[PDB]
Amino acid sequence: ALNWFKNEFFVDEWNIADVVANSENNYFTMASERDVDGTFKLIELAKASKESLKIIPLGSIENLNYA
Amino acid sequence: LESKLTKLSEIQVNWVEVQFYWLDLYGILGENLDIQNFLPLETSKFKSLTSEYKMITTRAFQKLTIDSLKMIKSSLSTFLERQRRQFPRFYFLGNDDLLKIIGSGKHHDQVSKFMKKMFGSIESIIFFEDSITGVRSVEGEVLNLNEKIELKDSIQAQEWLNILDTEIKLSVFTQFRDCLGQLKDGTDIEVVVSKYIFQAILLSAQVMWTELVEKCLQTNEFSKYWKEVDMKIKGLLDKLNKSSDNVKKKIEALLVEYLHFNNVIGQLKNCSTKEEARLLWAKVQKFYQKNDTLDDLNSVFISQSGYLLQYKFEYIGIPERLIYTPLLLVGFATLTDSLHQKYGGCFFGPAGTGKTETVKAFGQNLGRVVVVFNCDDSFDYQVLSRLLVGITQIGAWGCFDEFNRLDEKVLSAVSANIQQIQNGLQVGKSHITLLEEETPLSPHTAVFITLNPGYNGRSELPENLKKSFREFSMKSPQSGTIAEMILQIMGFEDSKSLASKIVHFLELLSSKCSSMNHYHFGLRTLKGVLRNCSPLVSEFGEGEKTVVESLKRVILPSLGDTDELVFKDELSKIFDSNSKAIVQCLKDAGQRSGFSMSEEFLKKCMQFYYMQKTQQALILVGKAGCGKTATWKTVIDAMAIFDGHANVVYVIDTKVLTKESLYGSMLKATLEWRDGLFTSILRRVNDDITGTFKNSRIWVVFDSDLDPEYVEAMNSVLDDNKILTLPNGERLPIPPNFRILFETDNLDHTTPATITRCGLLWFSTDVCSISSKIDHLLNKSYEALELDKLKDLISDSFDMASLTNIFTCSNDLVHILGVRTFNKLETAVQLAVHLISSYRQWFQNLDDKSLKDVITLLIKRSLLYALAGDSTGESQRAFIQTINTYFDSQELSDYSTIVILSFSSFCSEIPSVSLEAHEVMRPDIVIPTIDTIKHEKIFYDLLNSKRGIILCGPPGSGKTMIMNNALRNSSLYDVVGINFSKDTTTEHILSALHRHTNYVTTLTLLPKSDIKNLVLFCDEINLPKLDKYGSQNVVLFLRQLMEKQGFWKTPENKWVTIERIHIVGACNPPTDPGRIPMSERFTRHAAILYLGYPSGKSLSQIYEIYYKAIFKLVPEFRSYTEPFARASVHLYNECKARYSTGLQSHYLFSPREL
Amino acid sequence: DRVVYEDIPGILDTVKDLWGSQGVWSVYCTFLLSWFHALITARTRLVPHGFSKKYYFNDCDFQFASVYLENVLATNSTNNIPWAQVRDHIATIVYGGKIDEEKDLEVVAKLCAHVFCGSDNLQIVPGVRIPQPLLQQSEEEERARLTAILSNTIEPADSLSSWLQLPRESILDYERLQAKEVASSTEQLLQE
Ligand SMILES: Nc1ncnc2c1ncn2[C@@H]1O[C@H](COP(=O)(O)OP(=O)(O)OP(=O)(O)O)[C@@H](O)[C@H]1O
Ligand SMILES: Nc1ncnc2c1ncn2[C@@H]1O[C@H](COP(=O)(O)OP(=O)(O)O)[C@@H](O)[C@H]1O
Ligand SMILES: Nc1ncnc2c1ncn2[C@@H]1O[C@H](COP(=O)(O)OP(=O)(O)O)[C@@H](O)[C@H]1O
Ligand SMILES: [Mg+2]
């Protein structure tokens, strides 16, 4: 019954690839709960888009300067 | 003469340090050729320093140099980094050790000292006529190299170290090949044990076992091979009793492996079908061998669950082999699963389950020593990355024990580095880029982490880091199998039933005891029980008496009051069932120390001695002032008497010093390591320049609370690793004679990771009686000073029959700053003895009755001001009434005193005060009342008794006033004023004494003056705030000053001595807002005086004296002094009553307003 | 631009995603592993009944299980596939490594026994059935056959109970609580 509204009215859904492709912004923010990380989706998207990701974790001054 | 000797010793130490530094400099640059051209400016600086050192040496033979050398050490950082790059195992050595090993151009004996640091299982190198014959393991095993290494004079350390490293692998492979060929010839392993090293025999036996088991698996027969393995195990068990110690260790480890072989074959025999047998054989680890490889070191590979790993053929020695439990095999399987894709192995679960040991055993089975690191808060991103580039170049298997202890920022930051290492291993990258320098990546490296989640003060790994590790749960180990196999190996005739009884007893003790937080009865206590039962077979035999005695000696001291009865009942239910010299030595040590050997004290001393006999780290827990320090000091004295080994003790307070001062801190400006205090002590013990610590027992006592953040940095020290892993990479071993003591009052905040590692002694009640404590205190006070006649008078007057009822009556009083009456005896005894020794001058001109009455009056006064000195006026009156009734004796009243020997009162002691008009603004003026002179006299009497004084009372009561008024009329004491705040440190106290004291090396913090003592008046002592674990830095610092009489200097880790500095504290009631209760371990050392508000009549009299002094200016209104003062006092009282703290927080009124 | 990443709620959606993200027995084992991963990740959301705690299964576990399956199929060229070995390794080492409890290990082993039973006719869900590969198909033909099997599946409204083999009481409790929370939130959202 909860999903009936989505199945009835809205006839389209957007995944991460659709949001990245259909947005004019060059800056994106990703949020998730603890113990769930979605960087593999971004790596797969970069592989599909034939681009290169530079994975820079933050937390230290050396990584901040590198970033 | 003593000062001259101390100066000569300091000059000798400085000269020895300068000579060692110059010898290292001469070795690295001053002697070798073609080494001066790398850095020409540093070459010229080294030439100038060498010329200065030569001139100084010529002047001495006929400071600033050390400063210049230390300045040019920073110029040698790049050179040392390149030297570490040349031989990658130098990352485990310090800079001074690196200087020593490079500078040994022709000595070639300093490298055998650092074998243990660099290699982990080699303690020395066997030399023979300027050549290397072989290496010697830590356990004493001797490995002979295949070919002798020829050494020259121009050769330096790195290339001969590299060829020795390769020769060790070649020798291990050669011994393995010879042993495997001899086993293929058909001989039994009992003759092969006494020929080759343990690792070769282990690998050959494993290869033969897997080949024969696969042969038996080609068919469906296992009984013949199972019986053959059983006879082999019986043969090794028979050979165990008739072999040397080295062969004993070798046979024990082979027995572990053969018991695993027999277990696997027996499990395979009981399989119903072929598929179950095939699955079981695929699950267990198998040691195959390539027959077509032309490379020798890659010819043996290890298979488990399909995946393949390569044996490295690194020297292991004869390690303590672990019992093969099913959890161990599943852990090996998941480690192989993680390492197949070059990931990182990970184990998580509660402490004492076999995680670090499992990783080490996996490394040993894979033929390499696992280098284990103990992570800490100080491990920043740069330090951890330096450790990673140390272990990637070497190729060693790095285990990061306690990975939760890292900061969350560091855990997030090193995720890129760990992913880079994993990707470089997976894709075969030759060079990885870490810390902006391209370093080679050895294909043998791996990373392991063993976190312990679910504890306080531990971070959580981010998921982008946890996705790089394959974690496995290690919640429940199999203690039954471990106990059964260990008991079988040690020679116990009944092993299955005995191990089942041990495990059942431990389970029932865990289930039927009180729910205290320090009761952990897991795998570590079973290992301790077995390790204690191993020596006991000489005097008890391999049976049930041995295990019963071991269970008692391990578990009983850590139990409470009723838990001891539960232990005795359960030990009687499950199990069926001289020490004269040590007891005599203990009694002699107590007699020389002045203690009274009761049943409780002797029982605690026996428990301490028997538990330390096999345990290296101890915790002593009990009430404040229950007898912990006396216990371990008496036992150490008895140890020195009984064994003849001298004892050195280092009492360190853990929470007074910061971690950077305790362990150490890298200086980020120059990347230079600075030794802490415990690290400095350990390094001095390990180096042993003078040979003093060779045959002496070293005790390090941590006399403070068990902060997890402070103690879990020593996790690798406490457990079987016995290695202090520093951030810079140094691996300081713990000698067998180096023991660590933990003295604490509670275990509320400590973790099970610390309690389980250390043997624990619990003090349920005080170890001394009340009268025995009084007698010992009297003896100490007598020794601190006719004398024989006066000693009998005080002791006879201390009648215990009235004293016990006096103490019972005193227990009912209301005491501010609550201290047990067992702890207040020092004030009473020392004050009474000081008063007797003060009035001894006029004790030769009076009769015996007068002497008895004066002594009784002084003892009654001391008992009053000790037992009820921290109570209100009405309570003090009630207590003086009850001490008068509970003692013919001279009566002491509320104002009784002795003047110069006659008894008088305070009403005749009041001096007339006629203040001038202009003297009101002088802050040192005090109007003498009864309470003022009484408090002043008792404060001066307590301060002359060499005791700390804590003055308690409401604000504006007159604590600082009584301080200044008592100390103004004396030329023997100076006063320094320190006002504590919410955020006060030890550095503020030391800064307030920098202009008042002198540092003299006779170190000693003597007062600046020569005739006047110094009094440290600390105000608002409650104000310094607790940390997140509930401890005050300043309060423990002042407790250290009062009790131990000194402190450890943070920068040069040296001990000072406080000689003529007294401490007086001023505090408010703890019920006041913003005030916190201080620890009783500090308040135990200080006499407490309660200074209350003056009475309304007394306030009116004081301020009518003030108003008369004022109205001396206006003579026509001198008749209104009393109404004005009474009006002002009434106004103050009504303002105090009406406007309370409940309306506003700043509505605090005092006589300061008046 | 803000994107919140979370696991796909549906079971069939998870199977479709894991299948579209990718001899013939390797394809068959990958299909079975994708089904098993979807079922176990759907079971993880039921905190008090599906498991005894909150476990998170991610793409690394699927990658390791797939690598193990490929290694088993590569090293056993006799086509006597050790399904018991695969069951034990996946339920104990790959997916059961993080499992700290014992009943959860039992339910993971039962899920592996249901999915990786290696029978000719496998009823992984009450509607769909996965026949084993034949001896003359191709890789592309096998992929087409398995995606045709997946496409024809229609997920019933009680997939949290009928597909996971669970009693309906806890499923009804969980669904009722979630529906109540969402409906109350949108009721107080719609009133103003
Ligand atoms: N057997 C004994 N005979 C005489 N005096 C004893 C005996 N045992 C302990 N005492 C006395 O008990 C007092 C307090 O004991 P101790 O110094 O060992 O305290 P502690 O356990 O170190 O406490 P804290 O945490 O306050 O430092 C000492 O002054 C000591 O003289
Ligand atoms: N077969 C075995 N497996 C695991 N632990 C064992 C075995 N035999 C003995 N032990 C003992 O169990 C203890 C496990 O400690 P460990 O779990 O490694 O500490 P940590 O929890 O810090 O890693 C060790 O002291 C070791 O002596
Ligand atoms: N002879 C006296 N007897 C009692 N109280 C006095 C006498 N003379 C002054 N006082 C009051 O005692 C106060 C001293 O308070 P003070 O000691 O400074 O507070 P604290 O105890 O918090 O340091 C003075 O403000 C003064 O008003
Ligand atoms: Mg550990």
Q: B954 a known binding residue?
A: yes
Find the DSSP H helices in B958-1095.
959-968, 986-992, 1033-1043, 1080-1083
Q: Which residues of C touch B472 (CB under 8 A)?
A: 93, 97-98
Query: Beta partners for B723?
Result: B733
Q: Which residue type is seen at C59?
A: D
Centre a 10 Å sphere on the Cβ of residue C74 and count the other Cβ atoms it contains.
Answer: 10
Q: Mark B693-722 as b/e (b = at least 16 C-beta within 10 Å).
A: beeebbbbbbbbbbbbbbbbbbbbbbbebe
> How many pairs of residues across B and C have Cβ atoms under 8 Å apart?
51
In the three-class reduction of DSSP (H, G, I as helix; E, B as strand; rest coil), residue C51 is classed as: coil
In the three-class reduction of DSSP (H, G, I as helix; E, B as strand; rest coil), residue B569 is classed as: helix
Structure tokens at B669: 């400006």
B453, B405 Cβ separation under 8 angstroms: no
d(CA B1136, CA B1150): 8
Q: Which residues of A touch C7 (CB under 8 A)?
A: 36
B600, B631 Cβ separation under 8 angstroms: no
Q: Which residues of B touch A55 (CB under 8 A)?
A: 416, 419
B797, B856 Cβ separation under 8 angstroms: yes
In B435-492 the beta strands, taken as DSSP E runs, fall at 437-440, 446-451, 469-473
Residue to probe by mutation, ligand 2, list B260, B263, B357, most atoms within 8 Å of CB: B357
Cα within 13 Å of Cα(B1114), Cβ side: 8
d(CA B5, CA B13): 12
Chains near C (3 or more Cβ pairs under 8 Å)? A, B
Query: Beta partners for B672?
Result: B667
d(CA B128, CA B133): 6
> After which residues, if any, is chain C broken (C to N > 2.5 Å)?
22
**Which residues have CB under 8 Å from C189's CB, separation 6+?**
none
Structure tokens at B843: 């004790």
Strand pairing category for B307-310 and B672-675: unpaired
Query: What is the C-alpha radius of gyration for chain C, rounded to an integer number of angstroms?
Result: 18
In the three-class reduction of DSSP (H, G, I as helix; E, B as strand; rest coil), residue B724 is classed as: strand
d(CA B960, CA B973): 15
Identify which of B409, B435, B464 has the shortest CB distance to residue A39. Answer: B464
Q: Name the DSSP class of B8.
A: H
If you write DSSP's letter for every residue of B492-561 in order, what string do you get? -S--HHHHHHHHHHHHHHHHSS---TT---SHHHHHHHHHHHTGGGGTT-SSHHHHHHHHHHHHGGG--S
Q: B629 a known binding residue?
A: yes
d(CA B1003, CA B1006): 9
CB burial of residue B413 (10 Å; 0-12, 13-18, 19+): buried
d(CA B710, CA B713): 6
Structure tokens at B10: 């300091």
B569, B625 Cβ separation under 8 angstroms: no
Q: Which residue type is seen at B686?
A: N
Number of helical H runs and strand E runs in chain A: 4, 1
In the three-class reduction of DSSP (H, G, I as helix; E, B as strand; rest coil), residue B673 is classed as: strand
> How many pairs of residues across A and B have Cβ atoms under 8 Å apart?
41
Give nearest CA residue, ligand 2 atom 5. B354
Q: Which residues of B touch A35 (CB under 8 A)?
A: 463, 466
Cα within 13 Å of Cα(B620), Cβ side: 27
In the three-class reduction of DSSP (H, G, I as helix; E, B as strand; rest coil), residue B1144 is classed as: coil
C171, C46 Cβ separation under 8 angstroms: yes
Q: Name the DSSP class of B27.
A: I
Give nearest CA residue, ligand 3 atom 24. B1152
Q: Mark B786-808 as b/e (b = at least 16 C-beta within 10 Å).
A: eeeebbebbeebbeeeebeebbe
Ligand 1 centre to CA of B631 (Å) is 8
d(CA B657, CA B676): 10
Residues with CB under 5 A from ligand 4 (ion): B 356, 401
Q: Name the DSSP class of B1000.
A: E
In the three-class reduction of DSSP (H, G, I as helix; E, B as strand; rest coil), residue B638 is classed as: helix
Query: Measured between CB atoms, does B426 come within 8 Å of chain C?
Result: no
Give nearest CA residue, ligand 2 atom 19. B352
Element (H, E) at B647: strand B647-652
Chains near A (3 or more Cβ pairs under 8 Å)? B, C
Q: Which residues of C touch A1 (CB under 8 A)?
A: 179
User: φ and ψ at B667, to 5 degrees?
Assistant: -85, 115
Q: Comparing C-alpha atoms, which of B701, B578, B583, B596 is closest to residue B642?
A: B583
Identify which of B340, B341, B473 has the shortest CB distance to residue C98. Answer: B473
Cβ contact (<8 Å) for C71 and B306? yes
CB burial of residue B648 (10 Å; 0-12, 13-18, 19+): middle
d(CA B126, CA B119): 15
Tell me how far CA of residue B73 lies from CA of B46, B78, B371, B728, in angstroms.
Answer: 10, 10, 28, 16
**Which residues have CB under 8 Å from B841's CB, separation 6+?**
none
C8, C14 Cβ separation under 8 angstroms: yes
B765, B822 Cβ separation under 8 angstroms: no
d(CA B248, CA B236): 10
In the three-class reduction of DSSP (H, G, I as helix; E, B as strand; rest coil), residue B1085 is classed as: coil
Query: Measured between CB atoms, does A22 come within 8 Å of chain C?
Result: no
CB burial of residue B756 (10 Å; 0-12, 13-18, 19+): buried
Cα within 13 Å of Cα(B1136), Cβ side: 17
d(CA A59, CA A65): 11
Q: Comparing C-alpha atoms, which of B446, B400, B410 is closest to residue B716?
A: B400
B139, B197 Cβ separation under 8 angstroms: no
The coordinates were experimentally obtained by cryo-EM
Q: Which residue type is seen at B297?
A: L
Element (H, E) at B303: strand B301-304
d(CA B176, CA B222): 27
If you write DSSP's letter for every residue of B193-251 in order, what string do you get? HTTS-HHHHHHHHHHHHHHHHHHHHTTT--HHHHHHHHHHHHHHHHHHTTS-HHHHHHH
Strand pairing category for B902-904 and B897-899: antiparallel
Residue B304 to chain C, least CA–CA distance (Å): 11
* Angle, CA C138 vertex, CA C136 and CA C140 arms, to 5°: 155
In the three-class reduction of DSSP (H, G, I as helix; E, B as strand; rest coil), residue B131 is classed as: strand
d(CA B817, CA B830): 21
Q: How far apart are the first and last CA of chain A?
A: 47
Element (H, E) at B744: strand B738-744
Which atom of ligand 1 sits closest to the CA of residue B626? 21
B693, B648 Cβ separation under 8 angstroms: yes
List residues in chain B touching A: CB distance below 8 A: 380-382, 408-413, 415-416, 419, 435, 460, 462-464, 466-467
B274, B267 Cβ separation under 8 angstroms: no
Least CA distance to A36: which residue of chain B?
Answer: B463
Strand pairing category for B723-725 and B731-733: antiparallel
Query: Beta partners for B1087?
Result: B949
d(CA B172, CA B610): 41
Element (H, E) at B166: helix B157-184
Q: Which residue type is seen at B1055?
A: W
Cβ contact (<8 Å) for B410 and A59? yes
Cβ contact (<8 Å) for C1 and A25? yes
Cβ contact (<8 Å) for A16 and C5? yes
What does the CA dihedral C166, C170, C172, C174 come to, rounded to 10 degrees?
-120
What does the CA dihedral C81, C85, C91, C92 come to, rounded to 10 degrees?
-150
Residue B865 to chain A, least CA–CA distance (Å): 59
d(CA C77, CA B360): 35
Ligand 1 centre to CA of B1045 (Å) is 16
Element (H, E) at B592: helix B580-593
Query: Beta partners for B1019?
Result: B979, B1066
B333, B305 Cβ separation under 8 angstroms: yes
Query: Measured between CB atoms, does B471 come within 8 Å of chain C?
Result: yes
Q: Which residue type is seen at B461?
A: L
Whether the CA torsion B190, B193, B198, B199 is positive or negative: it is negative
Query: Beta partners for B308?
Result: B303
Q: Extract long-range pairs of A34-42: CB within 8 Å, 24+ residues apart.
A: A34/B460, A34/B463, A35/B463, A35/B466, A35/C56, A36/B463, A36/C5, A36/C6, A36/C7, A36/C56, A36/C58, A37/B462, A37/B463, A37/B464, A37/B467, A37/C58, A38/C5, A39/B464, A40/B467, A40/C59, A41/A16, A41/C5, A42/A16
C61, B463 Cβ separation under 8 angstroms: no
**Which residues have CB under 8 Å from B549's CB, separation 6+?**
B533, B536, B540
Tell me how far CA of residue B538 lies from CA of B245, B535, B542, B608, in angstroms.
Answer: 15, 6, 9, 21
Centre a 10 Å sphere on the Cβ of residue C18 and count the other Cβ atoms it contains.
Answer: 22
Q: Which residues of B touch C94 (CB under 8 A)?
A: 337
Ligand 4 centre to CA of B692 (Å) is 33
